[PDB]
RNA sequence: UAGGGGAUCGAAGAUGAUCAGAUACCGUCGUAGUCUUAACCAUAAACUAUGCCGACUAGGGAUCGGGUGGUGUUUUUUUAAUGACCCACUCGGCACCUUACGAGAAAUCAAAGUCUUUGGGUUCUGGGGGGAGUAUGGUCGCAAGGCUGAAACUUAAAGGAAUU
RNA sequence: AAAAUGUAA
C-alpha cells in the first residue's frame, strides 16, 4: 500500500463549508417538567394516529 | 459389563411406555429393585409385579398401565445433606405439587417427604413421574 | 491447491535448511 | 401440426352424451345438428366440432367407447354379462395332496380326499 | 354383548367353503395376523371361519350405528368387486366410489367427489393406501379386507379374507347387508333365506 | 385440578386412550372412537345405545388397533373366544 | 456427500480386493468395484449365417457361438457404454431391463 | 355472507355448539376459518415481522413476502399464521385466515401452590423445530414472561403470566423459535398429571346426535 | 456415560483433562501466559505515552478506496517505535 | 543395508509426434523398482470418515457354520443308512428391503435411537479459519522421515447439507 | 485428435 501519500487536505471539507450558527432557541425545562411534556406529547392528546407514531415526521 | 442393574430394568421400561405395553420383563433383578417397584405401586404409578424364582439371579414381569411416563436413574450413588432434597426438586421434577425422588436411607428405600418426617439420609437412586 | 504438493514443498525445504545448519558445526 | 385442442374434445363430448338418440356418419347433418341444438360464434369453429364427432361415431358402433357413456350402456352391459353355457363342479370332486388331506380331516365335509406325490 | 342365535351355523359356514374364503396365503404372513386353523403345508395356511364371522358381525355393529345410512363410503380398487360395492349402496343408500379414487374425496371440499363420511370401507388395503391417509386426517373409522400379506396401517378392523380376487369380494359385502337389516331393519329371524342372489355380485366378463 | 375453596378450575377436559391410558388431545388426527350399538331382542341395535372405544393416533400408525380391539371387545362379551391373552 | 450406501460398488465384509485391468483403456480397477458384462453372442452377424451353411458340409452344419466378459473402469462405461445414469430414487434400481 | 359446507360447518351456523371446547374435546379438525370466529369473537392480532423470500428464474428473480403474524387472546387460545403472498397486504389478510385453521388450547396452573386462578404453568414441557429446543418452566407470581422479545408477546396473547425459558442451538430465527413454542404449549396436555388420573366417560360426538340436521338438503 | 467417567473416585481424571482443554482458550491462554508482560505495546496498562517520530500518510483498503492520514509514535517504558491513528477531521495541525 | 535372482510392466532418463510453448497428456526403449532371505522404516480417503463391552424398540425374505423336527424327496443293490436339497424353527452372523410413531442442520441412520422426559460402564481428540502440523528443544531412525509440538502476525469470514 | 484468457465503468 501507500506509506507516503498526500496530507494537503488536513481539515479540507471541514472549513470549505458555509458559516451558519445557532440562534437563541426557546427555553426547555430541566428534570420533572421535561418528562411531563413527553407523557402528553405521545400518549394523552397523542401526536398523530396516522399509521403508527411520529415525533420527527416528514414535509407533510 | 453389567454395572447398574436398576438402570437396565428401567431401560426396557422407557421404550415399553413409548409403545403402549401392558406388560414388561426385567432381568436379573436385585433386592434394591424390589423395594423400588413398591415405591411407584405405593402412589399409583405402576401396578403389581410377580417375581419369578429361578436358581440364578431372578426375573420380574411387571404389569404396567399407562400412568407412568419417565423412570430413570442417577449414577453414581450420591451423597445428600438435607439441603440437596430442596434443590433437586427443581433439578428435574416436573412440578412442585407432584413427583417423587426416591433414594436410599438407613431405615429403608423411600422418598424425600417421607424422609422429611424422620430426618433420615444416605445415597440416591432415581427420579419418578 | 493440492495439499500433497504443499507437503512436498516443506519436505525439501526442511531438508535444505538442515544441511545449512550443519555448515555451522 | 394439425391436432384437436381442449375446446374441441370438450364440446364434441357434451353434445353426444345428451343428444345421442340422433346423429349419423354424415358431415352435412352433424354440422347442421350443431346449428339446431346449441349456439356458436363462427362457422370454421363449428365445422371442427362436427368432424371430430363423426370420427367418434365410428368407434361407438364397435361396442365400448373410451371415456364416454350415458346410462343406456349400463343396461346393455347386464345383457352380455352371462357367458359359458357348459360350465368349468363336474370333473370328479376334489384334487388334493397328502397335506391337504389332513386339512379336510379337521374342518370340512363335502370335500373328499385324494393323494398326489410332489417332489418338494 | 351377545344377540340371541347369532352364533355358530352349519348353513352359513358351508357357503363360505363354496367361496374359497378358507384358503390362506403363501410365503407372506404379516405379524398382526395369527388367525389360523392349522398350517397347510407346501407354503400355505388356513383361516378360522368362526373368527371371521366375528370380524364381520362386529364392524357391522358400527355400520348400523351411524345416524344417516348414506354417508358410508364404499371404495373399490379391484375391478372384481365393482358391481359388489354398487349393490351394497343400492340396498342401504350409501355412496360407492369404484374405479378412480382421486386425492380429495375426504379433503378438498371444492370437488364433486368430496363426501363427509362417518364410516369408511376398503377392499384392498395395499393399493388403496391413498384412501388410508384420507381418513387419518379427519378422525374417521377405517375398515380393510386383509389376507396375510396386506399391511394393516392406520386401520381399525382387519378381517381375514381373500383379497386375491375371484368370488371372495362378492361374498363379504353380501352378508354385510343381511346384517344391517337383521339388527334394526327389514329382516325377521335366523331361519331367513333372503330372496337376494349372490350371483348378481362377483366378477362378470368381459 | 382445583383451588383453595374447592371448585373445578382450569377450563377444558381432554379425553384418554382406553387401550394405553394415554390422553387424547386435539392435535391427533388419527385417533378413532368406536360406536358399537348394543343389540337385544329380535336384533335392534338401538339409536342411542353405543359402546365407546379409544384407539389413539399412534396405535393406528403401527396397526395395533387390532390387537387391543380383540382385547377390549373380548372382556365385555361381544367376542366369543377368538383372541387369547396367555401367549 | 455420500450418495450410495456402497459408495462405489460394495465393500462390506472384506476390506480389500484384487484389482484387475480395464479392457478399453486398461486402468486398474478393484475386482468387485469394477464393471463386467456378458457378451453371449454368436460367431458372426445376422446375415452371413446362411452363407456359411451354403459352403460348409454336413447336414445343416451346427452354427457355434462366442461368450465373453468386458471389464471397464467407470470412465469407459460412460463414454458411450453401459450407463445413461439415473435419478434420485431410480438409482437404487437393481433389475437388468 | 358466510354459509359454510359439511356437517361441521352447518351445525355451527345452527347454534348447537357455542363453545370451542367441544371441538378440541373430540380431537376433530378445522376446515373453515369463519367457524372458529362464531365461537371466538374476541380474537386480537399481533404481527411479528416480514422477510422477503426470493426465488430465481431463467430471467432474473421473483421475491415474495414471508409475514409472521399470530392471533389469539388472553385466556388459553392462540393461532399460528404463516403466509407467503405476492404483497405485504395480501400476506396480512390471508395470514390471519391461516392462523384460524391452526388454533390450539394451552395448559397452565400454579407454580407449586393451589390458591385460585391459574397464574403460572403446569409441568416441564418443550417443543423443537429444526435445531431450536424451547423448554418451559413454571414461575412464581409477581415475575414476568422471561424469554426473547417475540416469544414474550406470544405468551402474552396466550393467557399466561409467569414463565422461564432455556434454549439450545441457533435461535436468532423467528420461524423456528416461535414454531418450537407452538410445540411446547401443545405438549401441555400430552404429559400425564396426577390431578387428571380419573377415567372419563368420553361422551358421544355432537356431529352424531346433530348428524340428523346437517346431513344434506 | 457418553464419552465421560461418572466415577466417584475418578475425580482427578476430570481435573486432568480440564486444565489441558483450558489451554485451547484464547482468553485463558493470554491470561496465564502474561502476553502483555512480555510483548504487547501495553504492559498491564490501558493508557500510555509516546513521542512523535514523524508524520505519515497511510491509506485504506477494500471494499473502499481512500486515505487514512496517520502518524508515528514511540514507547517510553519500552523504547519501541510504533504507529497510531489520528481521529476527527484534520487536527494534524495541532499534533507536530 | 547387504546377497540372490531379475520374464513382464515400469518414478528417472531417452525419444518420434503433439502445442503458441510441451521438460505434460500419445507412442517406443529402459536404471532403481516390482519377487525372495535376513534387518529396517511405522505413515495411509489405514473409512463403515461410525472406538470397546451391555440392554431394549421393527414386518419380512435371502444367506454361511453348528443345532432340532418332518411317517418331505433324491441315491438303489433293497426298506436301507448316511451324504445332497426342501420346509418349520433356532443362536453367532454377512448384508438387504419397506417404513422409523424416533432422532437428526439436512442428506440421512433400527442406529448416527433410548439427548431439556437432559446420567449403563469407559478410552482418545477438537473449541472460527489461517500462520502451521511450521519453529526451538527433545526423542527413535542408516538416511528419508516419524512422535510430541509453539510464537509473532492476519482476518469476517472458512465451512457443511439442501431448494430455484 | 486438437481448441487459453478476462480492465475501475
Swiss-Prot record, chain B:
Record bears the keyword Zinc-finger: no
InterPro entries: Ribosomal_uS8 (IPR000630), Ribosomal_uS8_CS (IPR047863), Ribosomal_uS8_sf (IPR035987)
Leader sequence segment: none
Gene Ontology annotations for the cellular component aspect, listed alphabetically: cytosol; cytosolic small ribosomal subunit
UniProt key word Cell membrane: no
A GO molecular function held by the record: structural constituent of ribosome
Coiled coil stretches, renumbered: none
A Pfam family the protein falls into: Ribosomal_S8
Main location: cytoplasm
Domain of life according to the entry: Eukaryota
Localization (cell): Cytoplasm
Keywords: Cytoplasm, Ribonucleoprotein, Ribosomal protein
Example of a GO biological process term: cytoplasmic translation
Family: Belongs to the universal ribosomal protein uS8 family.
Role this protein plays: Component of the ribosome, a large ribonucleoprotein complex responsible for the synthesis of proteins in the cell. The small ribosomal subunit (SSU) binds messenger RNAs (mRNAs) and translates the encoded message by selecting cognate aminoacyl-transfer RNA (tRNA) molecules. The large subunit (LSU) contains the ribosomal catalytic site termed the peptidyl transferase center (PTC), which catalyzes the formation of peptide bonds, thereby polymerizing the amino acids delivered by tRNAs into a polypeptide chain.
Additional note from the record: Present with 40400 molecules/cell in log phase SD medium.
Protein name as catalogued: Small ribosomal subunit protein uS8A
Curated annotation (Swiss-Prot), chain C:
Zinc-finger found in the keyword field: no
Swiss-Prot/TrEMBL GO biological process terms: cytoplasmic translation
Residue ranges crossing the lipid bilayer per the database entry: none
Keyword Thylakoid: no
Main location: cytoplasm
Compartments in which it is found: Cytoplasm
A GO molecular function held by the record: structural constituent of ribosome
Region (Disordered): 1-25
GO cellular component assignments: cytosol; cytosolic large ribosomal subunit
Record InterPro entries: Ribosomal_eS32
Keywords for the protein's UniProt record, in alphabetical order: Cytoplasm, Ribonucleoprotein, Ribosomal protein
Note, other: Present with 11900 molecules/cell in log phase SD medium.
Family that this chain belongs to: Belongs to the eukaryotic ribosomal protein eS32 family.
Subunit structure: Component of the small ribosomal subunit (SSU). Mature yeast ribosomes consist of a small (40S) and a large (60S) subunit. The 40S small subunit contains 1 molecule of ribosomal RNA (18S rRNA) and 33 different proteins (encoded by 57 genes). The large 60S subunit contains 3 rRNA molecules (25S, 5.8S and 5S rRNA) and 46 different proteins (encoded by 81 genes).
Record's function text: Component of the ribosome, a large ribonucleoprotein complex responsible for the synthesis of proteins in the cell. The small ribosomal subunit (SSU) binds messenger RNAs (mRNAs) and translates the encoded message by selecting cognate aminoacyl-transfer RNA (tRNA) molecules. The large subunit (LSU) contains the ribosomal catalytic site termed the peptidyl transferase center (PTC), which catalyzes the formation of peptide bonds, thereby polymerizing the amino acids delivered by tRNAs into a polypeptide chain.
Protein known as: Small ribosomal subunit protein eS32A
Gene designation per UniProt: RPL41A
Curated annotation (Swiss-Prot), chain D:
Family according to the record: Belongs to the eukaryotic ribosomal protein eS17 family.
GO molecular function: structural constituent of ribosome
Keywords: Cytoplasm, Ribonucleoprotein, Ribosomal protein
Location, primary (coarse class): cytoplasm
Classification via InterPro entries: Ribosomal_eS17, Ribosomal_eS17_CS, Ribosomal_eS17_sf
Subcellular location: Cytoplasm
Pfam families: Ribosomal_S17e
Organism: Saccharomyces cerevisiae (strain ATCC 204508 / S288c) (Baker's yeast)
One cellular-component annotation, GO: cytosol
Transmembrane domains' residue ranges: none
The encoding gene: RPS17A
GO biological process: cytoplasmic translation; ribosomal small subunit assembly
Function: Component of the ribosome, a large ribonucleoprotein complex responsible for the synthesis of proteins in the cell. The small ribosomal subunit (SSU) binds messenger RNAs (mRNAs) and translates the encoded message by selecting cognate aminoacyl-transfer RNA (tRNA) molecules. The large subunit (LSU) contains the ribosomal catalytic site termed the peptidyl transferase center (PTC), which catalyzes the formation of peptide bonds, thereby polymerizing the amino acids delivered by tRNAs into a polypeptide chain.
Subunit (UniProt): Component of the small ribosomal subunit (SSU). Mature yeast ribosomes consist of a small (40S) and a large (60S) subunit. The 40S small subunit contains 1 molecule of ribosomal RNA (18S rRNA) and 33 different proteins (encoded by 57 genes). The large 60S subunit contains 3 rRNA molecules (25S, 5.8S and 5S rRNA) and 46 different proteins (encoded by 81 genes).
Domain of life: Eukaryota
Curated annotation (Swiss-Prot), chain H:
Disulfide bonds: none
Annotated InterPro entries: Ribosomal_Su5_D2-typ_SF, Ribosomal_uS5, Ribosomal_uS5_C, Ribosomal_uS5_euk/arc, Ribosomal_uS5_N, Ribosomal_uS5_N_CS, Ribsml_uS5_D2-typ_fold_subgr
Top-level division of the source organism's lineage: Eukaryota
A Pfam family matched in the record: Ribosomal_S5
UniProt subcellular location: Cytoplasm; Nucleus, Nucleolus
Main subcellular localisation: cytoplasm
S5 DRBM domain segment(s): 43-106
Signal peptide: none
Quaternary structure annotation from Swiss-Prot or TrEMBL: Component of the small ribosomal subunit (SSU). Mature yeast ribosomes consist of a small (40S) and a large (60S) subunit. The 40S small subunit contains 1 molecule of ribosomal RNA (18S rRNA) and 33 different proteins (encoded by 57 genes). The large 60S subunit contains 3 rRNA molecules (25S, 5.8S and 5S rRNA) and 46 different proteins (encoded by 81 genes). Interacts with snoRNA U3. Interacts with MPP10. Component of the ribosomal small subunit (SSU) processome composed of at least 40 protein subunits and snoRNA U3.
Similarity annotation: Belongs to the universal ribosomal protein uS5 family.
Protein name: Small ribosomal subunit protein uS5
Amino acid at each position: 500500500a501507500k506509506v507516503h501519500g498526500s496530507l494537503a487536505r488536513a481539515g479540507k471539507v471541514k472549513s470549505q463549508t458555509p458559516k451558519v450558527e445557532k440562534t437563541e432557541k426557546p427555553k426547555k425545562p430541566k428534570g420533572r417538567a421535561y418528562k411531563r411534556l413527553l407523557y402528553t406529547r405521545r400518549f394523552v392528546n397523542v401526536t398523530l394516529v396516522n399509521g403508527k407514531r411520529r415525533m420527527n415526521p416528514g414535509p407533510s | 459389563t453389567r454395572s447398574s442393574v436398576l438402570a437396565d430394568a428401567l431401560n426396557a421400561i422407557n421404550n415399553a411406555e413409548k409403545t403402549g405395553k401392558r406388560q414388561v420383563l426385567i432381568r436379573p433383578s436385585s433386592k434394591v429393585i424390589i423395594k423400588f417397584l413398591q415405591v411407584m405401586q405405593k402412589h399409583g404409578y405402576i401396578g403389581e409385579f410377580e417375581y419369578i424364582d429361578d436358581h440364578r439371579s431372578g426375573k420380574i414381569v411387571v404389569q404396567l398401565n399407562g400412568r407412568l411416563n419417565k423412570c430413570g436413574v442417577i449414577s453414581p450413588r450420591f451423597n445428600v445433606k438435607i439441603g440437596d432434597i430442596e434443590k433437586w426438586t427443581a433439578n428435574l421434577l416436573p412440578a412442585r405439587q407432584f413427583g417423587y425422588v426416591i433414594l436410599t436411607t438407613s431405615a429403608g428405600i423411600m422418598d424425600h417427604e417421607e424422609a422429611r418426617r424422620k430426618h433420615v439420609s444416605g445415597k440416591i437412586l432415581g427420579f419418578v413421574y | 491447491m493440492r495439499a500433497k504438493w504443499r507437503k512436498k514443498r516443506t519436505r525439501r525445504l526442511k531438508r535444505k535448511r538442515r544441511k545449512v545448519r550443519a555448515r555451522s558445526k | 401440426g394439425r391436432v384437436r385442442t381442449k375446446t374441441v374434445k370438450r364440446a364434441s363430448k357434451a353434445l353426444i352424451e345428451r343428444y345421442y338418440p340422433k346423429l349419423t356418419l354424415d358431415f352435412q347433418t352433424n354440422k347442421r345438428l350443431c346449428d339446431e341444438i346449441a349456439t356458436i360464434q363462427s362457422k370454421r369453429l363449428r365445422n371442427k366440432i362436427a368432424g371430430y364427432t363423426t370420427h367418434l361415431m365410428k368407434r361407438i358402433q364397435k361396442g365400448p367407447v373410451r371415456g364416454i357413456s350415458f346410462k343406456l350402456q349400463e343396461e346393455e352391459r347386464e345383457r352380455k354379462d352371462q357367458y359359458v353355457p357348459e360350465v368349468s363342479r363336474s370333473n370328479g370332486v376334489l384334487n388334493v395332496d397328502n397335506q391337504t388331506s389332513d386339512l379336510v380331516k379337521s374342518l370340512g365335509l363335502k370335500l373328499p380326499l385324494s393323494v398326489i406325490n410332489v417332489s418338494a | 354383548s351377545l344377540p340371541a342365535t347369532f352364533d355358530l351355523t352349519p348353513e352359513d359356514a358351508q357357503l363360505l367353503l363354496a367361496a374359497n374364503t378358507h384358503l390362506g396365503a403363501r410365503n407372506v404372513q404379516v405379524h398382526q395376523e395369527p388367525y389360523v386353523f392349522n398350517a397347510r403345508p407346501d407354503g400355505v395356511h388356513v383361516i378360522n371361519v368362526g373368527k371371521t364371522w366375528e370380524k364381520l358381525v362386529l364392524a357391522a355393529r358400527i355400520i348400523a350405528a351411524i345416524p344417516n345410512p348414506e354417508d358410508v363410503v364404499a371404495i373399490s380398487s379391484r375391478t372384481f368387486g365393482q358391481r359388489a360395492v354398487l349393490k351394497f349402496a343400492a340396498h342401504t343408500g350409501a355412496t360407492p366410489i369404484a374405479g378412480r379414487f382421486t386425492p380429495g374425496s375426504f379433503t378438498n371440499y371444492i370437488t364433486r367427489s368430496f363426501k363427509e363420511p362417518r364410516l369408511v370401507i376398503v377392499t384392498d388395503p395395499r393399493s388403496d393406501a391413498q384412501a388410508i391417509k384420507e381418513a387419518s386426517y379427519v378422525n374417521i373409522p377405517v375398515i380393510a379386507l386383509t389376507d396375510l400379506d396386506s399391511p394393516s396401517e392406520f386401520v381399525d378392523v382387519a378381517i381375514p379374507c381373500n383379497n386375491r380376487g375371484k368370488h371372495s369380494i362378492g361374498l363379504i359385502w353380501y352378508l354385510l347387508a343381511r346384517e344391517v337389516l337383521r339388527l334394526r331393519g327389514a329382516l325377521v329371524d335366523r331361519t331367513q333365506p333372503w330372496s337376494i342372489m349372490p350371483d348378481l355380485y362377483f366378477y362378470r366378463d368381459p | 385440578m382445583e383451588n383453595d375453596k374447592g371448585q373445578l378450575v382450569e377450563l377444558y377436559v381432554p379425553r384418554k386412550c382406553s387401550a394405553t391410558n394415554r390422553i387424547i388431545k386435539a392435535d391427533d388426527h388419527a385417533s378413532v372412537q368406536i360406536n358399537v350399538a348394543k343389540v337385544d331382542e329380535e336384533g335392534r341395535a338401538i339409536p342411542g345405545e353405543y359402546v365407546t372405544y379409544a384407539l389413539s393416533g399412534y396405535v393406528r400408525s403401527r396397526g395395533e388397533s387390532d390387537d387391543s380391539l380383540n382385547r377390549l371387545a373380548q372382556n365385555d362379551g361381544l367376542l366369543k373366544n377368538v383372541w387369547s391373552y396367555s401367549r | 456427500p455420500k450418495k450410495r450406501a456402497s459408495n462405489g460398488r460394495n465393500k462390506k465384509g472384506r476390506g480389500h480386493v484384487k484389482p484387475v485391468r480395464c479392457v478399453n483403456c486398461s486402468k486398474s480397477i478393484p475386482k468387485d468395484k469394477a464393471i463386467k458384462r456378458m457378451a453371449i453372442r454368436n460367431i458372426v452377424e445376422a446375415a452371413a449365417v446362411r452363407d456359411l451353411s451354403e459352403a460348409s458340409v454336413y447336414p445343416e452344419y451346427a452354427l457355434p457361438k462366442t461368450y465373453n466378459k468386458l471389464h471397464y473402469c467407470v470412465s469407459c462405461a460412460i463414454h458411450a457404454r453401459i450407463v445413461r445414469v439415473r435419478s434420485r430414487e431410480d438409482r437404487k434400481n437393481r433389475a437388468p431391463p | 355472507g358466510w354459509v359454510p359446507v359439511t356437517k361441521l360447518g352447518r351445525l355451527v351456523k345452527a347454534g348447537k355448539i357455542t363453545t370451542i371446547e367441544e371441538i378440541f374435546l373430540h380431537s376433530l379438525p378445522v376446515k373453515e376459518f369463519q367457524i372458529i370466529d362464531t365461537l371466538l369473537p374476541g380474537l386480537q392480532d399481533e404481527v411479528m415481522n416480514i422477510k422477503p423470500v426470493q426465488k430465481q428464474t431463467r430471467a432474473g428473480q421473483r421475491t415474495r413476502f414471508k409475514a409472521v403474524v399470530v392471533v389469539g387472546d388472553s385466556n388459553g387460545h392462540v393461532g399460528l399464521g404463516i403466509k407467503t403472498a405476492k404483497e405485504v397486504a395480501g400476506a396480512i389478510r390471508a395470514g390471519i385466515i391461516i392462523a384460524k385453521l391452526s388454533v390450539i388450547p394451552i395448559r397452565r396452573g400454579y407454580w407449586g401452590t393451589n390458591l385460585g386462578q391459574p397464574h403460572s404453568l403446569a409441568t416441564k414441557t418443550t417443543g423443537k423445530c429444526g435445531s431450536v429446543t424451547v423448554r418451559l418452566i413454571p414461575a412464581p407470581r409477581g415475575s414476568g414472561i422471561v424469554a426473547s422479545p417475540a416469544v414474550k408477546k406470544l405468551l402474552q396473547l396466550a393467557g399466561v403470566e409467569d414463565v422461564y425459558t432455556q434454549s439450545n442451538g441457533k435461535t436468532r430465527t423467528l420461524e423456528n423459535t416461535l414454531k418450537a413454542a407452538f410445540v411446547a404449549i401443545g405438549n401441555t396436555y400430552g404429559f400425564l398429571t396426577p390431578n387428571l388420573w380419573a377415567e372419563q366417560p368420553l361422551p358421544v360426538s355432537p356431529l352424531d346426535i346433530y348428524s340428523d340436521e346437517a346431513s344434506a338438503q | 456415560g457418553k464419552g465421560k467417567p461418572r466415577g466417584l473416585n475418578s475425580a482427578r481424571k476430570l481435573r486432568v483433562h480440564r486444565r489441558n482443554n483450558r489451554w485451547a482458550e484464547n482468553n485463558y491462554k493470554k491470561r496465564l501466559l502474561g502476553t502483555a508482560f512480555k510483548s504487547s505495546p501495553f504492559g498491564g496498562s490501558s493508557h500510555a505515552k509516546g513521542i512523535v517520530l514523524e508524520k505519515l500518510g497511510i491509506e485504506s483498503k477494500q471494499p473502499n478506496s481512500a486515505i487514512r492520514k496517520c502518524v508515528r509514535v514511540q514507547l517510553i517504558k519500552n523504547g519501541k517505535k510504533v504507529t497510531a491513528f489520528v481521529p476527527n477531521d484534520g487536527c494534524l495541525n495541532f499534533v507536530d
